[PDB]
Amino acid sequence: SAMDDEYTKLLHDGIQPVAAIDSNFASFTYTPRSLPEDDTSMAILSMLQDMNFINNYKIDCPTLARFCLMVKKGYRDPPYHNWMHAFSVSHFCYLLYKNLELTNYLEDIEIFALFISCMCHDLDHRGTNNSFQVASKSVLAALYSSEGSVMERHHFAQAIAILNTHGCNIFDHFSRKDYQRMLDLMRDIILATDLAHHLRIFKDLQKMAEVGYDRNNKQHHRLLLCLLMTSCDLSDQTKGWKTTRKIAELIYKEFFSQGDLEKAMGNRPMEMMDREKAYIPELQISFMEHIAMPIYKLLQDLFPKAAELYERVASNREHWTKVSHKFTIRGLPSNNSLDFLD
Ligand SMILES: CNC(=O)c1ccc2nc(C)c3nnc(-c4ccccc4Cl)n3c2c1
Ligand SMILES: [Mg+2]
Ligand SMILES: [Zn+2]
Numbered sequence: 001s002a003m004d005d006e007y008t009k010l011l012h013d014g015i016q017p018v019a020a021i022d023s024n025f026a027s028f029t030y031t032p033r034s035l036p037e038d039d040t041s042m043a044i045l046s047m048l049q050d051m052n053f054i055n056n057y058k059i060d061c062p063t064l065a066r067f068c069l070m071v072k073k074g075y076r077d078p079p080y081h082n083w084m085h086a087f088s089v090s091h092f093c094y095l096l097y098k099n100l101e102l103t104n105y106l107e108d109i110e111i112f113a114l115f116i117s118c119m120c121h122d123l124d125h126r127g128t129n130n131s132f133q134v135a136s137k138s139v140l141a142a143l144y145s146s147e148g149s150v151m152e153r154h155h156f157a158q159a160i161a162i163l164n165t166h167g168c169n170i171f172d173h174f175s176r177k178d179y180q181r182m183l184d185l186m187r188d189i190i191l192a193t194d195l196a197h198h199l200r201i202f203k204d205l206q207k208m209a210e211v212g213y214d215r216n217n218k219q220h221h222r223l224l225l226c227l228l229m230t231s232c233d234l235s236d237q238t239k240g241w242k243t244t245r246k247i248a249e250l251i252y253k254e255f256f257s258q259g260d261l262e263k264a265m266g267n268r269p270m271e272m273m274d275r276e277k278a279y280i281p282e283l284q285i286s287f288m289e290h291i292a293m294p295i296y297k298l299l300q301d302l303f304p305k306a307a308e309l310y311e312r313v314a315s316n317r318e319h320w321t322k323v324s325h326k327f328t329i330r331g332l333p334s335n336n337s338l339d340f341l342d
Contacts, residue, residue, distance in 0.1 A: 003069055010041060010065040015054075018046045026098040028308060031239050032091035033084055033246075040087045041068050044119065047094045053112050059170050067168045071119050074158055078127030079253035090118040092235035096228060100303045105215060105224060109178065113185035114225060116159075116170075118232050121190045123158035125151065128258045130194070135267055149194040156190040185225070192226035193233050195291065201226060202294070209301040224302070231299050231309075237292045237316060238309045244316045248284055281324035288317040 021043055024030045035043060045068060048054050054064065075083035093115045096102060102111050133141040133150045144153040160183070163169045171179050191197060205227055214220050236247040252272075259273035271277045296310040333340065 003073065006041070007065055007069055010045065010069065011062055015045045015049050016042055018043075018050045021046060026095065028095055028099060028238065028312075030091075030095075031243055032088045033236075033243065035087075037084060037087075040083070041072055044068050044087070044090065047090070048115070051094065051097055051111070051115070053115070056108065057112065058173065060173070063167060063170050063172075067162065067170045068119075070162045070165065070168050071123070071159075074120075074123045074162060076124065076126060078125060079257075080247070080250040081122050081125035081127060081254065086119055086122055089121065089232045089235060090115060092232040092238075093118045093228070095235075096231070100305055102228075105213060106221060109181060110185060110221060110225060113182055114189060114228060114232075116182075117186050117189035117229065120159035120162075120186070121152075121155055121193050121229070121233070123155045123162075125155070127254045128261070130196075131270075132258055132262070135262065136265065149191055149197065152191050152194045152197075155193075156187055159186060159190065188222060189225055189229050192229045195230075198226065198230050198291075198295075205298050209298050213302055227295070227298060227302075230295055234292050234295060237288065237313045238296065239312070241316055241319045244284075244319070248280060252278065252280055279327070281320050281327055285317060285320050285324075288313065288320070293317065 018025055021035065021039070022030060032043075045054075045064065048059075048064070053059065054061070071086070072083050075081075075086060097111060097115075106114075128136075130148075130150045130152075132138075134145050140150050140154050144150045147153060163171065163183075171182050174182065192201075201223065205223055208220055208223050213224065236243055255273040256275040256278070259269035259275060262269040262273070268274075272283050293310070293313050296306070296313050299306045300310045332338070
C-alpha cells in the first residue's frame, strides 16, 4: 500500500533540514510551488521542526507523520484547490513566522493553530464555491447552508475527522483546555477563509491597523489571525508574474468548469465563471484592486517588513494592465483562419 510505505519513510528516515530543501526556502521570493509534490510532506515536517512546534508541543512523530499524509490525501485534484495550494499556503505561514516576528503579536498556540489551519483550510474541496452547494442542493449545503460558509465548515469538519482518526490526533496529549483552544482556533481561522467573512471584518481590520495592534486585546489577536490567514490564502499574488499568470489559469479553469455545470442545470453562472462572458484581465485587476491589494496594504501597515509583499502584488496588478491588449485578436489567428467566427 502506498500511504504505508510513504509513512514508513517519513517517520523513520528523519526530518530533513529546511535549508536542504532550498537555499532561499525561508525567503518571500521563494515559490513553494516549485517544490516537487513528492517532497512536500517532508517539507511540512521540516517547517514544523524549524518553527519548534514538534519540540515545544511534544508532538508524537508517528502521529504527526500520519497526520500530514492524511491531510495531503484529504485534498482532491481540481485545478486550483488541491494539495499544492494548501502546501503553498502553509509555506507562506512559515514565511510570515520567519520574516515578521509573529511571536511579538501572537501566542505560541495561535501561531501553531494558524499553520495547522493553513494545511487543512481547503480539505476535500470539489472545485465549486458556496453558492454552487446551495444551487445544486449538495450534501454539504444540507448540513451547513443555514449557517453559511458551507465549504469552510466542511473543511473544518474534515480537519476534525482527520484528528478523530485513530493514530492521527497530533493534539491528544494536550490538556483539556489547550485541546479546546486549538480546535476553537482552527474553527475561527478556517472559517475566516470565506472571503465573505473577510469583507465583513475588513472595517474592523482597518480600525485595528489605524489605532495600533494591542497584544493585550483578545479581539486584536482574533482579527490578526484572520488577516494572516487570508494573507496566506492569497499569497500566490505576492510572487512573480509567472506565478500570478499560472494561478489565474488554474483558478479560471476551475471557475469555468463550475459555470459549465451551472448552465447544464439551467442556471446562469456568475460572469467570472462563465467562459463566454468572463474577461480575465479585467476580472483579475478587479480581484487585485478590490481584495488582494488592500489585504497586503493592511499587512504592511501592521508589519513594515511586509512592504515588499504589497509592492509585489501592486506590480503584478500593473502587469495585468500591460498584457490586457493581448486578449484582443489582431491580424488573423494562429492558423490564418476565420473559421472560428462560425
Ligand atoms: C467572488 N470572487 C472570488 O471568489 C474570487 C475571484 C477571483 C479570484 N482570483 C484569484 C487569483 C484568487 N486566488 N484565490 C482566490 C480565492 C480566495 C478564497 C476563496 C476562493 C478563491 Cl478562488 N481567488 C479569487 C476568488
Ligand atoms: Mg477555501
Ligand atoms: Zn485556499
